[PDB]
Write a protein that binds this DNA or RNA. Structure first.
Lengths: 128, 66, 50, 214, 148, 131, 102
RNA sequence: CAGUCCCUCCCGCUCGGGAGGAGGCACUCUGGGGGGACUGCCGGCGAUAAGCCGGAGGAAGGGGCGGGCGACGGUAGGUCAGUAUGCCCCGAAACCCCCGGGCUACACGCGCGCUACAAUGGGCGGGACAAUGGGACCCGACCUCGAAAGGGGAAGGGAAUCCCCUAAACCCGCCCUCAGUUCGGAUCGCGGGCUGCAACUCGCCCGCGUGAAGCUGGAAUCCCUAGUACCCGCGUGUCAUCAUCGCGC
């Protein structure tokens, strides 16, 4: 089963199937990703799911675009959609929207364009 | 720390120089004047049910005018 | 001896087509046109504001 | 790298950072109980629309707020005892992982010095650093005069956290002593109403002045 | 298992100490007198710096497949000071990694695909993934969860 | 050895050799660690245990850098004006060589010497509101 | 097995649209297979210039934009089909480039 | 390896793990049409109007968000040194061409920028990350050599198809441990490299030596309100080189 999730410019395509429990981002294990803070948010959603479903399926997600943290956000975003699609269980959906509404909603924030008069510093950054 | 917590029950309206300060009404939940209603001043945003801390129950704000 | 030296580079190399200035000549895929000139002719190019 | 993956997996049972589940922590002061967030979270970094709501700071976790206060300490109007407190070199802003690591180490330092949950030490430090009086100018006919004022609890939280961060950053500045040690020491001093905590001292100062401007 | 299943920070050191055995790779005479990059201001602190570099280079051949001189130069390039002007990104030197590539090819671990770069031999693949399986069999003990 | 004299200039034994050599004017950290490697010693070891044989090795390296493996371009004044050889200037041998360069620039009435005589920037820097 | 790749460039989306309608309605009349019209990423050209003719005054700039739309249509090699493409009336704004690939 | 029978290769505990070709449109991406958000519904306020506040649901609510378009008139503001232009001056000069210098020069007052004043750091390896664009006397992979600046060849590409191309900020394992110094590089010499006929006046880069002030800055005062402010880099105009320049990502 496929699932998509966008963030900033990060886009994540996840495929999940019956399996041991291995979770692979870009073909790399979920447990040895060097950014620890990003690893925590990557591993946040499935914790509420329970180890049964953690060990009942295998998940592989490929991300591209944005930064590492945007990539982690997109990965978690797509993860929640994929897993709730597999279960089709309302109770877990309630658990997610209790913990975080963006799990099945997403953050539509995007960068504002920079404007003249010191364009580099930002849309709202001006001289003295 | 012999402070007197009290509960916001009503907001009279903005006051003070900049209008940042808010004139509020507070009910004394504890101490020697339990249950008393006091007009008081607040700095920082306020809601209906904030537990304002009081150094004294003696101070009551002057009535605001329009 | 009264002929200008051909200049392949430098500001003297390029020249606005319309008004004949040596100043800012914009070359977005080669217009060879002055900055003041571009304003009066952009809508005629089909350019549009957005 | 064993500590890294260890700390990664140990909070698998829903714990702040890596350790110190918050059921033990208790909010003694009645005012900040309905305003300090103690919800169970693994990573305290929402990126959420807390700014875009009137009271979106109620739902932000306390440690997240502490990291946010640490985020923005260098270079501004304030010159504590004639010091342009400025972080030219690798400023914490736009780098939340660095502050995350620094507060991680500060939590450990608080824990082993106190032999208890660092989070409860933070709660006590904030409770003991919170001012109870301020002043404001009120006029009538143009004649200004200062008037004593009470503070909304959330503002008390804000100023206490910012003052703790101020003291930590000032202490580490220009000095051999590292930043996490400064922060942990500031927290420890604040927890027990020690007058050398910049936060607690400035709390005493603001609680004065308003004392005589009633 | 594969290199993808282990951290690179430990794997590069393991590969460096393993390749230190084979004499095909050797720092030339100018090696100890040249810093590791144009973007770098100071000489390498350690003297094993050579054997890590190859241990890095070969690693990318396992990942990025056929890659030539210039893209590798770009990957190792970094941020350097420019006086009062702010820092800027620059490219690592050429010969430093070029001779490393020649040494790796002569060792038979890698081969060349002209017009595309250099790819990794099945011998090099088997060597790297044997090191990786060694490391993973190790790591599964200190970290049980990697068994999954 | 809290004090270790090398080629006429003292070094503190507390400092590492790559840092101790930098106390020598005319030798930098990039030269300090590179002669540390040429001597075969750890760059970071304490100079307090610098036995005199290492000192003799250091000064004999300084006698001829190229003969000890130091490249022709790691020297400060390669292709010397008076012999066409690459030698690493140091101490007074650096000082009077630069003084000779200054005399050379002065006697030719060139711009560089003109600025050197007047205390002005050789390389055409703008001094309308600076210096 | 031989196909014709056709690339149509147009600044006007509609001038492109009716020409695409012509070439697609050729297909089913001719009874020859036709892969759907592929819309390439529309190419945006941006040019910015300060409004002031002299130097005085604040800084104000004008950003002019040209959007040129690119579309691909790939069709089989049918002599009767391709005989009717040069008879297509094309507007001046639109341009057509055809390659015949195997 | 959406799934993918088929074929090949590497590991292994032979279960399984990974890469390449076929493969079809899953899904991403892209561009054409349409819907969705309309105070739409509920409660209160508002005179029962206009409208406001609150609540639900919903990706998105109270002009959804960000932009373009900015009148009547004035500023004898500036622009005739871009164009057109009245009056007046010269008209072998105030016309044209060329050479050389200058347009930088200097005790400073002064607007706006960059760096420094370091534990945050400095140094060594590895790990995860963009899009704006731009490319034919061009982008140039890739091969070879030089430590490098760069040099010889050259695939692909006149553009979803080739290239600029990697991110940096961040973390991991380790050394230096607080000093005007293991910070900072100005200034100064040598050699080498690059564009242009030529770069002292008047360009940039590579290596060595060199190390300047500055250790937070009074009066005063600017900016900002959500992907916003701060930090970090990249593309692009002028351009053969040259930005701490301007616009954009």
């Amino acid at each position: 089963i496929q699932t998509t999730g966008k963030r900033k410019t990060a886009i994540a395509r996840a495929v999940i199937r019956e399996g041991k429990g291995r979770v692979r981002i870009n073909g790399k294990p979920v447990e040895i990703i060097e950014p620890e803070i990003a690893r925590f948010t990557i591993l946040e959603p499935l914790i509420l799911a329970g180890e049964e479903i953690w060990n009942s399926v295998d998940i592989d997600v490929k991300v591209e675009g944005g930064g590492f943290m945007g990539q982690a956000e997109a990965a978690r975003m797509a993860i929640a959609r994929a897993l709730v699609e597999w279960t089709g269980d309302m109770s877990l959906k309630e658990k997610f929207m209790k913990y975080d509404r963006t799990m099945l909603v997403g953050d539509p924030r995007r960068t504002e364009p920079h404007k003249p008069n010191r364009s580099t510093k930002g849309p709202r950054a001006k001289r003295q | 720390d012999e402070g007197y917590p009290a509960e916001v029950i009503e907001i009279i309206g903005r006051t003070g120089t900049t209008g940042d300060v808010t004139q509020v009404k507070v009910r004394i939940l504890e101490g020697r004047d339990k249950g008393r209603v006091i007009r008081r001043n607040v700095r920082g945003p306020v809601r209906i049910g904030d537990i304002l801390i009081l150094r004294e129950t003696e101070r009551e704000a002057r009535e605001i005018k329009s | 001896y009264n002929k200008r030296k051909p200049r392949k580079f430098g500001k003297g190399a390029r020249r606005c087509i319309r008004c004949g200035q040596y100043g800012p000549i914009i070359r977005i895929q080669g217009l060879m046109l002055c900055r003041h000139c571009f304003r009066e002719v952009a809508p005629k190019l089909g350019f549009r504001k957005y | 790298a064993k500590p890294l993956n260890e700390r990664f997996f140990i909070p698998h049972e829903i714990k702040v950072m890596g350790r110190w589940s918050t059921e033990d922590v208790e909010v003694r002061d009645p005012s900040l109980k309905p305003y300090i967030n103690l919800e169970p979270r693994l990573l305290p970094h929402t990126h959420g629309r807390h700014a875009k709501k009137h009271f979106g700071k109620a739902n932000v976790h306390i440690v997240e707020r502490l990291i946010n206060k640490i985020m923005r300490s260098g270079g501004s109007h304030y010159k504590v005892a004639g010091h342009f407190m400025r972080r030219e070199h690798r400023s914490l802003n736009s780098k939340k992982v660095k502050a995350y690591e620094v507060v991680k180490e500060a939590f450990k330092i608080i824990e082993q010095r106190t032999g208890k949950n660092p989070i409860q030490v933070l709660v006590w430090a904030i409770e003991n650093a919170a001012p109870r009086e301020d002043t404001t100018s009120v006029m009538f006919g143009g004649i200004r005069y200062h008037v004593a004022v009470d503070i909304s609890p959330m503002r008390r939280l804000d100023v206490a956290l910012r003052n703790i961060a101020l003291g930590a950053s000032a202490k580490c500045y220009r000095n051999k002593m590292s930043f996490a040690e400064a922060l942990a020491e500031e927290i420890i001093l604040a927890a027990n109403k020690d007058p050398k905590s910049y936060a607690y001292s400035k709390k005493l100062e603001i609680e004065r002045i308003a004392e005589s401007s009633r | 298992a594969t290199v993808y299943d282990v951290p690179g920070d430990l794997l590069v050191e393991r590969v460096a100490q393993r390749l230190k055995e084979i004499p095909e790779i050797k720092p030339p005479e100018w090696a100890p007198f040249v810093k590791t990059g144009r973007h770098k201001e100071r000489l390498p602190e350690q003297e094993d710096w050579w054997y890590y570099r190859v241990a890095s280079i070969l690693r990318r051949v396992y990942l990025d497949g056929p890659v030539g001189i210039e893209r590798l130069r770009t990957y190792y390039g970094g941020r350097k000071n420019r006086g009062h002007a702010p820092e800027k990104f620059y490219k690592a030197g050429g010969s430093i990694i070029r001779k490393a590539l020649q040494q790796l090819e002569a060792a038979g671990f890698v081969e060349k695909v002209p017009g595309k770069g250099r790819v990794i031999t099945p011998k090099g693949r088997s060597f790297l993934d044997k090191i990786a399986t060694e490391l993973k069999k190790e790591l599964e003990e200190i970290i049980p969860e990697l068994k999954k | 050895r809290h004090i270790v004299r090398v080629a006429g200039v003292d070094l503190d034994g507390n400092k590492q050799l790559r840092w101790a050599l930098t106390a020598i004017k005319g030798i930098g950290i990039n030269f300090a660690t590179m002669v540390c490697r040429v001597a075969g010693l750890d760059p970071f070891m304490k100079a307090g245990y610098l036995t005199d044989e290492q000192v003799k090795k250091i000064e004999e390296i300084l006698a001829d850098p190229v003969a000890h493996g130091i490249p022709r371009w790691a020297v400060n004044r390669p292709k010397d004006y008076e012999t066409g050889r690459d030698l690493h200037l140091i101490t007074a041998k650096l000082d009077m060589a630069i003084r000779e360069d200054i005399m050379r620039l002065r006697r030719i009435r060139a711009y560089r010497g003109i600025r050197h005589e007047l205390g002005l920037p050789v390389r055409g820097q703008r001094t309308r509101s600076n210096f | 097995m031989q196909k014709a790749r056709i690339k149509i460039a147009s600044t006007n989306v509609r001038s492109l649209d009716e020409v695409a309608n012509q070439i697609k309605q050729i297909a089913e009349r001719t009874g020859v297979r036709m892969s759907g019209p592929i819309p390439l990423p529309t190419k945006r050209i941006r040019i910015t210039t300060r409004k002031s003719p002299d130097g005085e005054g604040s800084a104000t700039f004008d950003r002019w934009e040209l959007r040129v739309h690119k579309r691909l249509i790939d069709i089989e090699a049918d002599e009767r089909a391709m005989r009717q493409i040069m008879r297509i009336r094309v507007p001046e704004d639109v341009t057509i480039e055809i390659e015949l690939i195997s």
